[PDB]
Amino acid sequence: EDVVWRWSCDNGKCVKLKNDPRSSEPALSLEACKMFCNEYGLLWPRPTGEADLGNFLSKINLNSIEVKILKKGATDDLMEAAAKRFKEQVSLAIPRGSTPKLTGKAVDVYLVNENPNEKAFSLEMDESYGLRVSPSGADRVNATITANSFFGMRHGLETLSQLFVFDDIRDHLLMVRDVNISDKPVYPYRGILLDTARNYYSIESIKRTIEAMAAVKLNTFHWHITDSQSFPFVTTKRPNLYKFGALSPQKVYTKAAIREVVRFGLERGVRVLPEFDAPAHVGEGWQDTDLTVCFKAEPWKSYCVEPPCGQLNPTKDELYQYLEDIYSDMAEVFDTTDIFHMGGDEVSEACWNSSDSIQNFMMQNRWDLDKESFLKLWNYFQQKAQDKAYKAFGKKLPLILWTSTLTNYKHIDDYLNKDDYIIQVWTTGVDPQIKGLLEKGYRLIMSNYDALYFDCGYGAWVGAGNNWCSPYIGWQKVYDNSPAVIALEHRDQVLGGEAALWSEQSDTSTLDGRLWPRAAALAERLWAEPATSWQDAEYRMLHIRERLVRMGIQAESLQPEWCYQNEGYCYS
Amino acid sequence: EDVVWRWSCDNGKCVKLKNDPRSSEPALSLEACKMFCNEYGLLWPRPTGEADLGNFLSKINLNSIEVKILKKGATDDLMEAAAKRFKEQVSLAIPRGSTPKLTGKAVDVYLVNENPNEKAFSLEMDESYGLRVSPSGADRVNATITANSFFGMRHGLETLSQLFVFDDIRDHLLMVRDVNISDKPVYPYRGILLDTARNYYSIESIKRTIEAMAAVKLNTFHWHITDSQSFPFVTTKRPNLYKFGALSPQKVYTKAAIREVVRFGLERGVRVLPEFDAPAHVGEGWQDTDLTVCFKAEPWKSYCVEPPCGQLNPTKDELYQYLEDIYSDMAEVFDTTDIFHMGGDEVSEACWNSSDSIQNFMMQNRWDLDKESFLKLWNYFQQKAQDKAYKAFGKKLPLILWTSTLTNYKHIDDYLNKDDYIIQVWTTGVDPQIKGLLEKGYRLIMSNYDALYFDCGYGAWVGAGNNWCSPYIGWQKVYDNSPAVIALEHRDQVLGGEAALWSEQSDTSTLDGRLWPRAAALAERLWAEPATSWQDAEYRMLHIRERLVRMGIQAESLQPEWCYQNEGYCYS
Ligand SMILES: CC(=O)N[C@@H]1[C@@H](O)[C@H](O[C@@H]2O[C@H](CO)[C@@H](O[C@@H]3O[C@H](CO)[C@@H](O[C@@H]4O[C@H](CO)[C@@H](O)[C@H](O)[C@H]4[N+](C)(C)C)[C@H](O)[C@H]3NC(C)=O)[C@H](O)[C@H]2NC(C)=O)[C@@H](CO)O[C@H]1O
Ligand SMILES: CC(=O)N[C@@H]1[C@@H](O)[C@H](O[C@@H]2O[C@H](CO)[C@@H](O[C@@H]3O[C@H](CO)[C@@H](O[C@@H]4O[C@H](CO)[C@@H](O)[C@H](O)[C@H]4[N+](C)(C)C)[C@H](O)[C@H]3NC(C)=O)[C@H](O)[C@H]2NC(C)=O)[C@@H](CO)O[C@H]1O
């Protein structure tokens, strides 16, 4: 049948009221009410610049939307792909199984890309845009998107799609009549880390994630493609690593698949950034090389922090030949990235000391066998690895390492430099290492475990109880976690943030729930850096969850739908 | 390419070993190793009777499996449907995108249903079966399932499908050669509670849940189809309840849909048991009847424990007319159930005292307005409701109520009797109410919140932080929760158990993850009541998760796949 209710704005909340026939006032559908009742309407993220949505809606004919590219260039194929997708994005306004009446105004969308040859990812890229919507003549609409680059332009198309609403009372597709918006992201790096080594993720699932990322303007996909558990990456040069390494012959990422993901990503404004974690977090795939130590060493608690143990043996010269090949193979298919992630997490001293070949190597270099000794070995490794990385990508590009014993701010300059290395923070956001790093000039990516570890809260995977970083981190917490607060005066050194989904307890099946809608909170916090808190964004967050579900994403459910329909009744 | 590894049983663990060519020993694929390395092989749940799996496997031709029904009867259509499904169940052994070679033995499956007219659900039904597998002649296999009823027989088919394994080294479909199994469930009621009022669940999603339930022999689906938030149930007699009540016109359960679910359930050995929660947990749909009080009362914390508030007004005579109609409409489409759930949870005293009509009613009956007064009103309501329920189902059938203030063992006999009412326990398993109830003769269904609330652990839905019953309950905890321990000598009074998925934070999108594989732990605990603990069942639990994923269920991920491939390395 037909919707029985209507909604009316009262003090910023849309209140459900009976749609009684004896009325001269036109009834508002729920989304139509939310669009003007809300300070930012239905947008996510909210814009940083002008956010004028006017007061009215116009009826639109879905079959009459046409996109026009004003300036041609090298990005033509991308701009064209993006335009094509736009209609599909508009249909997201409409609930599945619902059909709009094909009547109303025609929409002309004009795309103005001011530097149409530009298509490289960089920390310095311009993701800004201007959006204006206004009536044109009598039966049509002028939607104009003006941007400095394709990336900004695509972001604008994303915002524009959000400006459509379906009236399920009348079955009309509607559009906000007069719009003036200008926008740009606060932070350049807005990412998600996906661990595809602890469990395999289908490439279809990866692409789906990228679509959702695009929907909320996240721009970086960090592919942690290797670990001790498996080696899915198809390295042509050193094929045994994958052959021995993979969970199965099927559970692999071929050169053709990666290229598919990288392009799908580029079309959607998302950098696909690969990681080769070293010298720890290696195991499977390395058998018979004699290039690792402690693989599957028991008891595991003695030698590492999760099974199975395994580290690279930095004393072996052939190792650098393998790395050089791996890095080269990665560089070939990950050809949009401007950055390389080298891991650097959790190197185990015991594990290195249990090796004879290694102890023998150190005795010959005059180094002792104490912990400060081991840092010497780690640097020796990192310096050589780094050389190979530069060679593979054919240039010196910024490298990322996790916070660790090596990266402690007190001695970090002994090993690295702030120009060459970006540091990824997984400590608490209140840890001293952060300020100390910042004072030394280091750029950071925030992944603090207390707010940004998407894996936390489930059952234990070793033993019983719950996982290491429990409890489960709610969206309220992710939204309120602010890099600006964490870094203060050094804010400009914060490149941005990244949500982490480690996969000890995640795969293809759970990936949609783990990331959405929580990653959307990160997305707003990074794009806009609101002074405001989670409660101010709550209604919009409920809507965006609904949108992800419309997209086919199996998003986590946040509240009862009754709450979404009845703003303000559900609080605490 | 091809699998590179092989597995070998050593001390109950299958160890991954290189499949080296210079060997005279035939290589074992992972599942083939697990089948005999494990005490119960790949079965879930493990059987209670004979569990002899022999030592060998035979190659089978998938296209040559034929099912024969030996005894005809009223259950013919069911037996026939079940047989048809069997081939599909066997294909689950085979990973998607993999094809077995069509060679090997032909399998004859003989179904012997000893009481082929029997198809009613009851607490007393015989779910037992006998299963024997042995070679027949030279090129074929005799698989014989012998059971007292169709329900037992279907359970046997389920066990038999589990006896197939795919050799992905050779691409051969295999079957355990000599099997002797006899089995029966420890407890008659093995359920899942699904809350479809707090959020809507697509009927496709409901059916999918039933398939997974069937896979592990759960037999009861408790459909909590109404609450304060919505009224999805399509009641022909009182249509405004759904019309006003539903989240949308689409989000409704029609008579045709319910019948579809009820039959899909009956075919799969699952009772579909509806709940009409009263007198609390009512709201939406009741507008303009004047039959409720406190709907949306603010502040909500004063009048209920979750928004929105709302209770039935028991003083209104017309109320019983509505209930009678609702119960009748439920009875018509839920025509396989032998039991009715009437709710009885969380009645609010304040909410009743805020009503004038109600206070006026009590003053006239000589009752005071203290809390013991209110219990009088609740019973008055429950007694009348109960009369309508009997009338609707046309017989006196057992009724279920939650543990509550009414059901406190100290005064319970003042209100109910142990013959007429089953009590559903959501308290901790160590709460005194349990023993006290048991001592008074009451039958119970265990849903203790500390072990069996599937909703717990996520973010808060009102305010911030985490939900009320956090932390997240892991499968280890569900498995170890034992009704036999909880009830001791009174065990026979425990009808069984039920996993609860309340839906404040769950819907169609999250339903697979919320239930699986955790509900499988409940399934084993209820079917077998093992003396053993979770660690003893761990490898099998990993396999069953994989099976649910093969089924198309988006099961939660429990551990790294590396762990599944490398038994014993991952522990704590
Ligand atoms: C069983 C138990 O509870 N034992 C207690 C412990 O409370 C206590 O210390 C705990 O020991 C655990 C090691 O078994 C530590 O767990 C590990 O924590 C690390 C992070 O420090 C995890 O690795 C990182 O995080 C992600 C996963 O979120 C992982 O994928 C990444 O590789 C990694 N990096 C982000 C750094 C790249 C690791 O997975 C996890 N291992 C597990 C759970 O098996 C735990 O941190 C530690 N807790 C504390 C508070 O120190 C123990 C002393 O060891 O004492 C026992 O009584
Ligand atoms: C915000 C906060 O943390 N406030 C604290 C509280 O610790 C403290 O008491 C808590 O008050 C909450 C009421 O707002 C209680 O939450 C409610 O708990 C009931 C169970 O008792 C939940 O209903 C049952 O459970 C399922 C959901 O799992 C539900 O769908 C069912 O309808 C129902 N039944 C199974 C019985 C049928 C209810 O959903 C939940 N409501 C929420 C979360 O909004 C909480 O139980 C209570 N905790 C304790 C330990 O008492 C408060 C005093 O009120 O003080 C504050 O400082």
Neighbours of B229 (CB within 10 A): 30
Amino acid sitting at position B312: L
- Active-site residue identified among A155, A172, A222, A281: A281
Beta bridge partners of A60: A105
Burial (Cβ within 10 Å: 0-12, 13-18, ≥19) of residue A139: exposed
Pocket test for ligand 1, best of A468, A469, A504 (most atoms within 8 A of CB): A468
Q: In this structure, which ligand is nearest to the CA of B563?
A: 1
| Torsion on CA atoms B222, B227, B231, B237, rounded to nearest 10 | 80
Please state which CATH class domain A1-184 belongs to.
Answer: alpha beta
Query: Is the CB of A571 inside a 6 Å radius of any atom of ligand 2?
Result: no
Q: What are phi and psi of A251, to 5 degrees?
A: -90, 75
- Distance, CA of A328 to CA of A382 (rounded, Å): 17
Tokens 């999603």 found at: B205
Instruction: State which residue of chain A sits closest to B299, comparing Cα positions.
Output: A569
Neighbours of B409 (CB within 10 A): 18
A534 CA distance to ligand 2 centroid (A)?
22
Alpha carbon distances (Å) from B211 to B165, B202, B220, B270: 20, 15, 12, 9
Alpha carbon distances (Å) from B450 to B206, B224, B438, B466: 25, 20, 20, 15
Residue nearest to atom 19 of ligand 1 (CA): A305
A305 CA distance to ligand 1 centroid (A)?
6
* A·B CB contacts under 8 A: 205
Asked if B477 and A471 come within 8 Å (Cβ–Cβ), the reply is: no
Q: How far is B7 from chain A (nearest CA, A)?
A: 14
Asked if A229 and B561 come within 8 Å (Cβ–Cβ), the reply is: yes
Beta bridge partners of A14: A9
Report the greatest alpha carbon distance in chain A. Answer: 95
- For every residue of B265-334, DSSP letters joined together read HHHTT-EEEEEEEESBS-BTB-TTTT-EE-TT-SSHHHH-SSSSP-EE-TT-THHHHHHHHHHHHHHHH-
* Intra-chain end-to-end CA distance of chain A, in Å: 35
| Torsion on CA atoms B287, B290, B296, B301, rounded to nearest 10 | -150
Residue nearest to atom 50 of ligand 2 (CA): B468
Q: In this structure, which ligand is nearest to the CA of B459?
A: 2
Burial (Cβ within 10 Å: 0-12, 13-18, ≥19) of residue B539: buried
Q: How far is A458 from chain B (nearest CA, A)?
A: 6
Mutate to test the interface with A, among B11, B196, B248, B553 (most CBs of A within 10 A): B248
What is the DSSP secondary structure assignment for residue B490, as one 8-state letter? G
Q: Which structure tokens are listed for B428? A: 């901790």
Name residues contacting ligand 1 (CB within 6 A): A 305-306, 345-346, 402, 426, 453, 455, 462-463, 468-469, 502, 504; B 572
Mutate to test the interface with A, among B509, B542, B547 (most CBs of A within 10 A): B509
Residue A59 CA, distance from chain mean position: 34
B420 CA distance to ligand 2 centroid (A)?
30
Q: Which structure tokens are listed for A176? A: 């906000």
- Distance, CA of B126 to CA of A54 (rounded, Å): 68
In our burial notation (b when 16+ CB lie closer than 10 A, e otherwise), range A524-555 reads bbbbbbbeeebeebbbbbbbbbbbbbebebbb
- Distance, CA of A544 to CA of A43 (rounded, Å): 8
Residues of A in contact with B519 (CB under 8 A): none
Output the CA angle B71-B74-B79, nearest 5 degrees: 60
Experimental method: X-ray
Q: In this structure, which ligand is nearest to the CA of A572?
A: 2
Q: In this structure, which ligand is nearest to the CA of B426?
A: 2
Closest CA to B57 of B39, B83, B25, B34: B34
Q: Which structure tokens are listed for A40? A: 């930012």
Asked if A1 and B249 come within 8 Å (Cβ–Cβ), the reply is: yes
The beta-carbon neighbor of A510 closest among B470, B557, B571 is B557
Q: Which structure tokens are listed for B75? A: 């259950």
- Active-site residue identified among B346, B507, B536, B556: B346
The beta-carbon neighbor of A509 closest among B476, B506, B557 is B557
Q: What are phi and psi of B333, to 5 degrees?
A: -90, -30
Output the CA angle A307-A312-A314, nearest 5 degrees: 155
Closest CA to A150 of A9, A39, A288, A268: A268
Closest CA to A399 of A494, A571, A273, A234: A273
Residue ranges per domain, chain B? 1-184, 185-572
The answer for residues whose C-beta is within 8 angstroms of residue B567's C-beta and 6 or more apart is B12, B13, B14, B15, B539
Residues of B in contact with A534 (CB under 8 A): 464
Q: How far is A85 from chain B (nearest CA, A)?
A: 24
Residues of A in contact with B199 (CB under 8 A): 557, 560-561
Q: For residue B139, give the 3-state DSSP assignment.
A: coil
Q: Which structure tokens are listed for B74? A: 């009223």
Tokens 């290229």 found at: A259
Q: How far is A542 from chain B (nearest CA, A)?
A: 11
| Torsion on CA atoms A315, A316, A319, A321, rounded to nearest 10 | 120
Residue nearest to atom 7 of ligand 2 (CA): B468
Residue B17 CA, distance from chain mean position: 39
**What is the three-state SS of A483-500?**
HHHHHHHHHHHEEEEEEE
Closest CA to A346 of A374, A385, A369: A374
Asked if B560 and A198 come within 8 Å (Cβ–Cβ), the reply is: yes
Asked if A460 and B474 come within 8 Å (Cβ–Cβ), the reply is: yes
The radius of gyration of chain A's CA atoms, rounded to the nearest angstrom, is 26
The answer for residues whose C-beta is within 8 angstroms of residue A435's C-beta and 6 or more apart is A490
- For every residue of A34-89, DSSP letters joined together read HHHHSTTTT-SSPPSS-EE--S-EEEEEEEEEEEEE-S-STTHHHHHHHHHHHHHH
Q: How far is B470 from chain A (nearest CA, A)?
A: 8
Residues of A in contact with B550 (CB under 8 A): none
Residue nearest to atom 46 of ligand 1 (CA): A468
Residue A90 CA, distance from chain mean position: 23
Active-site annotation holds for B346: yes
Active-site annotation holds for B227: yes
- Distance, CA of A266 to CA of B524 (rounded, Å): 48
Q: Which structure tokens are listed for B570? A: 């991952």
| Torsion on CA atoms B286, B292, B297, B303, rounded to nearest 10 | -130
- Distance, CA of B202 to CA of B41 (rounded, Å): 35
Q: How far is A225 from chain B (nearest CA, A)?
A: 14
Helix (H) or strand (E) run with residue A174 in it: strand A172-176
The beta-carbon neighbor of B561 closest among A200, A464, A470 is A200
- Distance, CA of B533 to CA of B552 (rounded, Å): 29
Burial (Cβ within 10 Å: 0-12, 13-18, ≥19) of residue A415: middle
Contact (Cβ atoms closer than 8 angstroms) between residue A459 and residue A478: no
Beta bridge partners of A253: A233
Closest CA to A562 of B309, B240, B508, B458: B309
Asked if A229 and B296 come within 8 Å (Cβ–Cβ), the reply is: no
Contact (Cβ atoms closer than 8 angstroms) between residue B48 and residue B183: yes
- Distance, CA of A389 to CA of A320 (rounded, Å): 10
Residue nearest to atom 25 of ligand 1 (CA): A502
Residues of A in contact with B466 (CB under 8 A): 471-472, 474
What is the DSSP secondary structure assignment for residue A572, as one 8-state letter? -
Q: What are phi and psi of A238, to 5 degrees?
A: -130, 70
- Distance, CA of B295 to CA of A566 (rounded, Å): 13
The answer for residues whose C-beta is within 8 angstroms of residue B295's C-beta and 6 or more apart is B228, B282, B283, B284, B286, B287, B308, B309, B310
The answer for residues whose C-beta is within 8 angstroms of residue A373's C-beta and 6 or more apart is A362, A367
- Distance, CA of B414 to CA of B283 (rounded, Å): 29
A571 CA distance to ligand 2 centroid (A)?
13
Architecture of domain A185-572: Alpha-Beta Barrel (3.20)
C-alpha count within 13 angstroms, C-beta hemisphere, residue A563: 24
- Active-site residue identified among B222, B281, B341, B543: B281
